[PDB]
Amino acid sequence: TNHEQVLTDYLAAFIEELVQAGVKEAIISPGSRSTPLALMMAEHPILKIYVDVDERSAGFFALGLAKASKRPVVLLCTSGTAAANYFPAVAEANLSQIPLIVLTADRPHELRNVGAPQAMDQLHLYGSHVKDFTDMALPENSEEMLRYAKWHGSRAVDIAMKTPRGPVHLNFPLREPLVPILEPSPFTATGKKHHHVHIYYTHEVLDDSSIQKMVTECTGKKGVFVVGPIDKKELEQPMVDLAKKLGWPILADPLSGLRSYGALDEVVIDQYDAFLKEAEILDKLTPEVVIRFGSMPVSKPLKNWLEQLSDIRFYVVDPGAAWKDPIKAVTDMIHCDERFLLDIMQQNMPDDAKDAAWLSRWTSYNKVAREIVLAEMANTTILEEGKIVAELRRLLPDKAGLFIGNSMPIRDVDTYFSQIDKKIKMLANRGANGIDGVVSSALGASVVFQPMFLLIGDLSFYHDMNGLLMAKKYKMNLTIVIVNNDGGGIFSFLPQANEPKYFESLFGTSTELDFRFAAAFYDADYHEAKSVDELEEAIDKASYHKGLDIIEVKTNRHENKANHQALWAKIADALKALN
Amino acid sequence: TNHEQVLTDYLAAFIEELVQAGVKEAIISPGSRSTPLALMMAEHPILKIYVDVDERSAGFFALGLAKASKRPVVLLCTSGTAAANYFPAVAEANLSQIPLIVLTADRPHELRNVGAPQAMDQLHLYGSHVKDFTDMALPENSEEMLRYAKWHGSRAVDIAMKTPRGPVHLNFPLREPLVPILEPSPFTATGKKHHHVHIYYTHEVLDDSSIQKMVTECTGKKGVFVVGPIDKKELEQPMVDLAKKLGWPILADPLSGLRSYGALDEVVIDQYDAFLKEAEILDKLTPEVVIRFGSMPVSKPLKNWLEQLSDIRFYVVDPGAAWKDPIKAVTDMIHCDERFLLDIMQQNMPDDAKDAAWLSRWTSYNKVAREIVLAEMANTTILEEGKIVAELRRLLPDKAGLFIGNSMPIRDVDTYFSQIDKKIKMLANRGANGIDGVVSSALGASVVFQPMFLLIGDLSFYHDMNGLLMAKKYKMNLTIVIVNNDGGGIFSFLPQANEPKYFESLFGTSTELDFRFAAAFYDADYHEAKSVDELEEAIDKASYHKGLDIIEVKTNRHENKANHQALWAKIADALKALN
Amino acid sequence: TNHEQVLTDYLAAFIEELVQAGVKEAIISPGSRSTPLALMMAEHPILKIYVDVDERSAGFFALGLAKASKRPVVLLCTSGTAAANYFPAVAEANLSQIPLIVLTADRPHELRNVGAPQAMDQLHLYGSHVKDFTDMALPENSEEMLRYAKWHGSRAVDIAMKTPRGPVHLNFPLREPLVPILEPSPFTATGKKHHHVHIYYTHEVLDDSSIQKMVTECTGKKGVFVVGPIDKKELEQPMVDLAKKLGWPILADPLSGLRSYGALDEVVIDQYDAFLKEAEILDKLTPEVVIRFGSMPVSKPLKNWLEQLSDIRFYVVDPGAAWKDPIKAVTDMIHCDERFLLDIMQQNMPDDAKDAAWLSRWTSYNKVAREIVLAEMANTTILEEGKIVAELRRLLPDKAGLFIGNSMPIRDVDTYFSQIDKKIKMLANRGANGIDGVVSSALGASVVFQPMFLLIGDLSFYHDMNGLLMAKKYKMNLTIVIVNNDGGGIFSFLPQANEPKYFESLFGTSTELDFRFAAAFYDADYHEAKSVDELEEAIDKASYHKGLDIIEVKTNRHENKANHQALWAKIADALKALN
Numbered sequence A, B, C: 001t002n003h004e005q006v007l008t009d010y011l012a013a014f015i016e017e018l019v020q021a022g023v024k025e026a027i028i029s030p031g032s033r034s035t036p037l038a039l040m041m042a043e044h045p046i047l048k049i050y051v052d053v054d055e056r057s058a059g060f061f062a063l064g065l066a067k068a069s070k071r072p073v074v075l076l077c078t079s080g081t082a083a084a085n086y087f088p089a090v091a092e093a094n095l096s097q098i099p100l101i102v103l104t105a106d107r108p109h110e111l112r113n114v115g116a117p118q119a120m121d122q123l124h125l126y127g128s129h130v131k132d133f134t135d136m137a138l139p140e141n142s143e144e145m146l147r148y149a150k151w152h153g154s155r156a157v158d159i160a161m162k163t164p165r166g167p168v169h170l171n172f173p174l175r176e177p178l179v180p181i182l183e184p185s186p187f188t189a190t191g192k193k194h195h196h197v198h199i200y201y202t203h204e205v206l207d208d209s210s211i212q213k214m215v216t217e218c219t220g221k222k223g224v225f226v227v228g229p230i231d232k233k234e235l236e237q238p239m240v241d242l243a244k245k246l247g248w249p250i251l252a253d254p255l256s257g258l259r260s261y262g263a264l265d266e267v268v269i270d271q272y273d274a275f276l277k278e279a280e281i282l283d284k285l286t287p288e289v290v291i292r293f294g295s296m297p298v299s300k301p302l303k304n305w306l307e308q309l310s311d312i313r314f315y316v317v318d319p320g321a322a323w324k325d326p327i328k329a330v331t332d333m334i335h336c337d338e339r340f341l342l343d344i345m346q347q348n349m350p351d352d353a354k355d356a357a358w359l360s361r362w363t364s365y366n367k368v369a370r371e372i373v374l375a376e377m378a379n380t381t382i383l384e385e386g387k388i389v390a391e392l393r394r395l396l397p398d399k400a401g402l403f404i405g406n407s408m409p410i411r412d413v414d415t416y417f418s419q420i421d422k423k424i425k426m427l428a429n430r431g432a433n434g435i436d437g438v439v440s441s442a443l444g445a446s447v448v449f450q451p452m453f454l455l456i457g458d459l460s461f462y463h464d465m466n467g468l469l470m471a472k473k474y475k476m477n478l479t480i481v482i483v484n485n486d487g488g489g490i491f492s493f494l495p496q497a498n499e500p501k502y503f504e505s506l507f508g509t510s511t512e513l514d515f516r517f518a519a520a521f522y523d524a525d526y527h528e529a530k531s532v533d534e535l536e537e538a539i540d541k542a543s544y545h546k547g548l549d550i551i552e553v554k555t556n557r558h559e560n561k562a563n564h565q566a567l568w569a570k571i572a573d574a575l576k577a578l579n
């Protein structure tokens, strides 16, 4: 009868089901309405909790932790504008297919839409950016209601985790009193037995008729793989193996894993962004079959090349039917597991069909472009942005995670990160390509991969400085390389940089913050790199420090276009006279 | 034919209409998609622009500027997660009825829902938190399309500004190239003439039959006014005048303006939160008529008193039919201008009907409670939270604006800000009562009222430190008093403070940040007050500094409940033996 | 340049893609805005068109045609309230997983939300009841825009057809002039070549670890199959074969196909609704494993039995993760093809594990209940509702389709349709269980199965009489048996039938329509059955008539409960003394 007991039984059934369905970490924000749910998550012995007071930074922290661990992560906040702060992470979880279980407390029906304090319409709050929305019942400890609480915990994880993965949103109207009964413990097998809903491991498969068609239309064709941002693990070697058994180049995004899976290989192309610009070379590269994996790669020239390819079989491997194809060039859509596709083609495609002139065409351009790029970077003392990427490529340990901010860092890794023989798990928020939350994302990922590193421009670092409070609070290890060009450097390349009247105020926002002060605020070892060996020293000192390190490299925004154009011409001119 | 010319003509018609409809300030965030709209806002000679790179802080900066100026303010951001960051300010603009014109650029239809970079579903992005949503056409310079662009500029402002005011959301799909033609100037009467849509000044009025009913049922009744957060200006004196001509007390929220309109008066009650707790006094205070103005006041005891009033005429003056009544006690709903109501009752209610024992009952309790509170604060040297409010009440200039953060600052002003004879415009984000964005809000309001002051707890200050970048960038004057109790002090009062096992991790989040470092980051004069005269010195130094000042006062969270209970008992015991 | 040519190129690319993706039939409603789309669908040589002027009846006609053919069906209507009429069919397509491509024309952006005639907000018109919504671009014949039109045609079908199937909604803003250019033909290979997007056949599969778990936990267990409304064809025999190789009864809904797949068998239970009511028998029937297929069966007693089963492994086979489980009893969720599951268990489960007492328990009750039911019906001359179902079971041809209305027809088929050795495809709108649109649904299904028959109560027949205009217009063959009890007979069973004061006005709405007149209106051969051989004659005459026949059987509403209770007691009393 006690409302506190009814409140306890209800939430205990929901949270226990969540944990047993695979949720191991809950990112909680402080509130009064969320009191019963947050207290019960604490009383769980198996669930790990991270408290973050900024609801925006909390969301991207769950985002990155779920990105890196591949497991479901619970967010929990109070009612009011707190839930609204989750919206940027939710939008990026949706586009980037991350399983977040968004729990938001709310006022009960009597305090809804009546002008009550700290109460807003939380119904369908995130719209189409969640896979499912549920407005839970007011707590009841009835038999059917305890089974309904458990039923929803199982449902929520399963939908979040089901291909294509994405965020899920449960709203909890909660009436006062809000203090549950934590003694005796609501869990710990201290009474009733749970009824966990086991979900079985299922995956999509190509039909045997479709397998034979796929194999037939791809035999002996001059083919090309395009692997953009991918996530499904252990697909690096199988892809390389199938590429070698056909004689096909893989144009590989940095976020594919292929530029850093632990070995060197000939099929991976990492300088396509460099040479797909030169028209006099494009004629010898024309394919007959493209097979895209994962998301669209970062490279704009590659996109414009794929766009203008006529008379071609353009396969797109989209498990879960997300229809991510911004050039709208698809000719054959394959709705099945990527693991399965690589495997049934490895065992069915002919090993004999190999035009060696085809792969030799691609690899030649690449090996030459790659070493002209590594040359100009090896013979420079100016710590320009290309050099930073170069030097991080050399200095990073094996088994090291690298989070990359959007804007210019993500593009420079494309140009200046050729393939290395280290396993370097690479992460980037590439759903909406937002500069918000990259600090909090890299922090959550640092829960999973260590050593963790973050390359990030200055504006994005300011945008999410509050994430660093988590590093201070939880004693996390992250090594942030801030490329401080004082503004938005990416805008110097776009055509708005010609007219200087309204520039700088708009694009390229001079900020003039001494990030030394921000590092003392969050108790971070701060280093400023001026030379090449200055940076070497810092990465080195950062390897002994189990904690937050921040390494600033001041660069000039207005020279970046010149160095990039000068280098691309050296690659274009070389490749232009290469037959 | 030129797409650039078509892009220019379209947006010029829309923005010119906005400016002529009353928009004088545009808060812009940097982006590539928003390039044409942001460039054209720059080429406007009359429109003032503020650039803020944090889209969340940009929104609350528009919120407060529109709060304080009472005029429409444009927000403009690029596509992607940038628009999602506006959502907390939008939610608070909706609940607090602020006219924000939210403009969000987007990719054109071909790049929508196809996996294009930095593109998300921006359709009905903010849901029910906007008054109107519009997905604009792709730019066209046709006659009908130029009139449609102008038609929407006029419509958008008018809906935003129409009672009940609130945010409005226009989405702009924009196809590349995105660089408009700014020379010759698209405005400046350099060609065509505009067709501005004049909107006429309209206001709701009570019918003459309803006037006679209102007057009749309220004559000679033992009545009480409840003015919570109000905004409509120049209603302070008329309310006080009508209260005196009936012999009725006004229970006045700090955000009503009545505790600081420039004069002292007997009808305003500012200690209701103190004495509505003592049951032995409530019997002599029972009213027969309540007339509520504006939002629900902050005070919980007052709410619980109004809730338990049976057999009473509970008028609620809600212009624009927003139905803000969390106790659901309304007996008569009045849908008309508050100015009009005060005026037709001033000229129609009988001057003779006055039971002096009624007002003497209320004013006595108040004058005694008020001076016991000012006594305990005048005779203390510990800069506890009550004292800070006391001392700011004494030290604040006339014609000074005071922004107040949520959580504990807003409640302490209720207890420790009796009425003063200065004009002190008081502001607080009281829609969703969020601790996010209070720094950015106070900053935007500082564009309007000077000198501007901000009282704020520590967590809320950390939550929106990025707002201070605006102060650095635009050289604004703000004097922030941070009440740093290291965590959430408001949670020590709630019943979750008894169980210490899971406290502190959840409620009351120890943060341990030296805000000295955050003040150097944003070039802010920093002062730490330990004594009473230390704070006096700082407010004083802050009055010469045209710039950002930050004044920290460390307080103990775990003593706050004791001082508040000790003081409330002194008021209860006194008032208990007072007849 | 010609807008007519641009309009033609755009829509030709979209419709051709639709046809090549599998759409063979378009159900069009007349309008001015839909003129370009409806004219072009006519100029297609392969697409069959059915015009229906009632937009509500048009939708259920597409519903049933897509239900029976298992293929995608296009709906097309004009702007305004016409699209709103699609909403009931859309809601039922969503719940019942039918692939409908809902195309709704609209006014262009300039005529949107401006008070233009016949224009309403068609954005997200059907909300969460569609799988996907798209607001198409204004027509453009650009390269990218022609590929975008085609891209969306392919996407729309694929999402509709992808498990779990459901409706899809494309909105088309169309600017005047609206007359396309049909000569020379936009299709017929009269110019350009198309680029069809082949989608490959994919299906979910259980992992090999999950297969071994499934097989292990189900070996030798006293198990039971529950097959409610199913649709995936050719699963009747495999299910029966797996049931026989385990010694497990199949509780089979009429809409499963199992009561009429062409043969007789012992594993199918068709009288569970009869005997799951008797408590003294339920103890001997307690299972250890339930494996549910398809939707929830109609039977309420079965649902209440499954609800109260404790300590049991409750498998639910839900391909596409729809989570349809109204008792919330699931213990193991299987997200894979039903075909696959029946097949991997046929080849892995042990043939030896068979407790014959288990199946003998179920089959005995069933064979006895079944023949007591067929006895009482064989020895009656009153054409009560049980008898009608009995006599249709005997008189229906092989290879005959039977559409069943909701309310009381669907329940009587459950009680009075034991298994027969004919192939009788059985259909019912069981998503939202609506009595609207059953005439139009059965009509569309009659496009696929012939001879087609429809059993329907009187109110539902009146609810969708307008569907019969399609039968008149297109010369279709349907034989409607109207069980006219003059009102809602289903309400005499519910507890509201005890209080007669407000009955009849509300539940059980006496209508008093002579349906003879409605049959002349739609040129339908009308027969009224009074005796058993009267009905035999009519079904017989109806078999020579290639056309619309309507056969009324007047029944008494207030006797139905008595006959049903009397019969259920004969079954309960018999089964009570049967060991």
Ligand SMILES: Cc1ncc(C[n+]2c([C@@H](O)CCC(=O)O)sc(CCOP(=O)(O)OP(=O)(O)O)c2C)c(N)n1
Pocket (backbone or CB within 6 Å): A405, A406, A407, A408, A409, A410, A433, A434, A435, A436, A456, A457, A458, A459, A460, A461, A483, A485, A487, A488, A489, A490, A491, B030, B031, B032, B055, B078, B080, B081, B082, B117, B118
């Ligand atoms: C929340 C939000 N709001 C605004 C933007 C727009 N936006 C960008 C997109 O164009 C980047 C798309 C991409 O990378 O694909 S980049 C950018 C400046 C970033 O400066 P930085 O971090 O110092 O980096 P660097 O100066 O380039 O070295 C902005 C402001 C955004 N992305 N997200």
Ligand SMILES: Cc1ncc(C[n+]2c([C@@H](O)CCC(=O)O)sc(CCOP(=O)(O)OP(=O)(O)O)c2C)c(N)n1
Pocket (backbone or CB within 6 Å): A030, A031, A032, A055, A078, A080, A081, A082, A117, A118, B405, B406, B407, B408, B409, B410, B433, B434, B435, B436, B456, B457, B458, B459, B460, B461, B483, B485, B487, B488, B489, B490, B491
């Ligand atoms: C965005 C968001 N997310 C979470 C909360 C919950 N919430 C509060 C509401 O209960 C305050 C409702 C109110 O004031 O009416 S107060 C609070 C702590 C504030 O600490 P402070 O600023 O240092 O102040 P002090 O410690 O009290 O001196 C939190 C975290 C919120 N309001 N908004």
Ligand SMILES: Cc1ncc(C[n+]2c([C@@H](O)CCC(=O)O)sc(CCOP(=O)(O)OP(=O)(O)O)c2C)c(N)n1
Pocket (backbone or CB within 6 Å): C405, C406, C407, C408, C409, C410, C433, C434, C435, C436, C456, C457, C458, C459, C460, C461, C483, C485, C487, C488, C489, C490, C491
């Ligand atoms: C559109 C809509 N609106 C109202 C109803 C409510 N409703 C019913 C549901 O309870 C039937 C749920 C079910 O079958 O599961 S049955 C019913 C009367 C039907 O009378 P009839 O066709 O003459 O049949 P008979 O009298 O039983 O022989 C109504 C009016 C509805 N279903 N759909």
Ligand SMILES: [Mg+2]
Pocket (backbone or CB within 6 Å): A041, A042, A043, A044, A045, A046, A047
């Ligand atoms: Mg714990």
Ligand SMILES: [Mg+2]
Pocket (backbone or CB within 6 Å): A457, A458, A459, A483, A484, A485, A486, A487, A488, A489
């Ligand atoms: Mg930068």
Ligand SMILES: [Mg+2]
Pocket (backbone or CB within 6 Å): B041, B042, B043, B044, B045, B046, B047
């Ligand atoms: Mg200007």
Ligand SMILES: [Mg+2]
Pocket (backbone or CB within 6 Å): B457, B458, B459, B483, B484, B485, B486, B487, B488, B489
């Ligand atoms: Mg505080």
Ligand SMILES: [Mg+2]
Pocket (backbone or CB within 6 Å): C041, C042, C043, C044, C045, C046, C047
């Ligand atoms: Mg035709």
Ligand SMILES: [Mg+2]
Pocket (backbone or CB within 6 Å): C457, C458, C459, C483, C484, C485, C486, C487, C488, C489
């Ligand atoms: Mg009937």
